[PDB]
Amino acid sequence: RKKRPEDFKFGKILGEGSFSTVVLARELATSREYAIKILEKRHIIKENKVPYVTRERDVMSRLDHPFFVKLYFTFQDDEKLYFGLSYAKNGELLKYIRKIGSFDETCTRFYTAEIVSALEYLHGKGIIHRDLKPENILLNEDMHIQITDFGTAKVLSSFVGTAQYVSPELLTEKSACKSSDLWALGCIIYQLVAGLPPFRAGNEYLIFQKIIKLEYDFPEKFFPKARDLVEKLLVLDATKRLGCEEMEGYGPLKAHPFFESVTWENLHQQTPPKLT
Numbered sequence: 001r002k003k004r005p006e007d008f009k010f011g012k013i014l015g016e017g018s019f020s021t022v023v024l025a026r027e028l029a030t031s032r033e034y035a036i037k038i039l040e041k042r043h044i045i046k047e048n049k050v051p052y053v054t055r056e057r058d059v060m061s062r063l064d065h066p067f068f069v070k071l072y073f074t075f076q077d078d079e080k081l082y083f084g085l086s087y088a089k090n091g092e093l094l095k096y097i098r099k100i101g102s103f104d105e106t107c108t109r110f111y112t113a114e115i116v117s118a119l120e121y122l123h124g125k126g127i128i129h130r131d132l133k134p135e136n137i138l139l140n141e142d143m144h145i146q147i148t149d150f151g152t153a154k155v156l157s158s159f160v161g162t163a164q165y166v167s168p169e170l171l172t173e174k175s176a177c178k179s180s181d182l183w184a185l186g187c188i189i190y191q192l193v194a195g196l197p198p199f200r201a202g203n204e205y206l207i208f209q210k211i212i213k214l215e216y217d218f219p220e221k222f223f224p225k226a227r228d229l230v231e232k233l234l235v236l237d238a239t240k241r242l243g244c245e246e247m248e249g250y251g252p253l254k255a256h257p258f259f260e261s262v263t264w265e266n267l268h269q270q271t272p273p274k275l276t
């Protein structure tokens with residue numbers, strides 16, 4: 001039953017990383033489009049990434065939620081590993097943030113809520129993403145989110161992700177917890193509303209300075225209830241972010257006033273607000 005490269009008509013490159021290329025592919029027998037992640041074995045071995053690639057495949061096998069990529073299949077030839085992933089027709093969330101500048105309140109609320117549910121599911125399984133960002137939050141043809149890129153993930157019984165979204169505890173204890181994803185969630189909300197990430201600067205080092213000093217500002221037009229929520233996520237003490245277990249988990253966070261009108265139980269059956 002293993003699939004093979006010949007079973008597909010490969011098309012355009014969707015994305016490139018240091019250790020992988022994601023290519024759109026149309027399976028011949030079915031007409032189905034998959035986003036196939038291709039990784040060269042030699043380069044993985046050379047750079048000691050075997051544990052990272054193994055962990056990524058293992059974590060993805062365990063994801064069975066409409067808000068996360070799905071691993072349909074894997075195979076390999078002599079030089080390469082192939083992971084068959086769900087194809088997110090409408091691409092990165094980042095693209096929409098730039099096209100429209102910033103989201104109105106209805107949109108921010110709806111998409112934030114979906115990210116929260118996704119995180120609730122993910123953290124429920126003791127998995128931490130460690131690199132959450134609009135680049136990693138994809139939109140499929142229905143405009144529901146699909147979170148991907150699990151090569152940096154950690155399974156709870158070393159790293160640093162993208163500078164703008166790195167939490168203080170990572171720059172301090174070199175540590176990482178569910179809270180780290182929640183910090184990143186705080187930045188993404190800020191970004192949906194403001195149009196830009198909260199911590200900006202000329203280089204990695206300057207960005208890290210602002211992060212540890214909690215140096216950022218809210219624009220005046222920022223939705224008040226959204227601001228309050230952000231202030232309860234962008235908290236230096238990881239032990240005091242809305243959503244973390246020390247703060248008693250996702251119940252209080254979902255009960256936040258910003259999510260007042262949200263029906264949490266069937267988000268992926270709701271039709272997303274039109275993005276304008």
Ligand SMILES: COCCOc1cc2ncc3c(N)nc(-n4ccnc4)cc3c2cc1OC
Pocket residue numbers: 014015022035037069085086087088089090091092138148149150
């Ligand atoms: C605008 O419409 C074009 C569609 O663009 C895309 C569709 C995707 N559809 C699906 C993915 C998927 N399952 N995984 C990853 N990815 C990135 C790291 N590791 C995995 C990436 C994509 C992916 C990336 C894409 O461009 C950035």
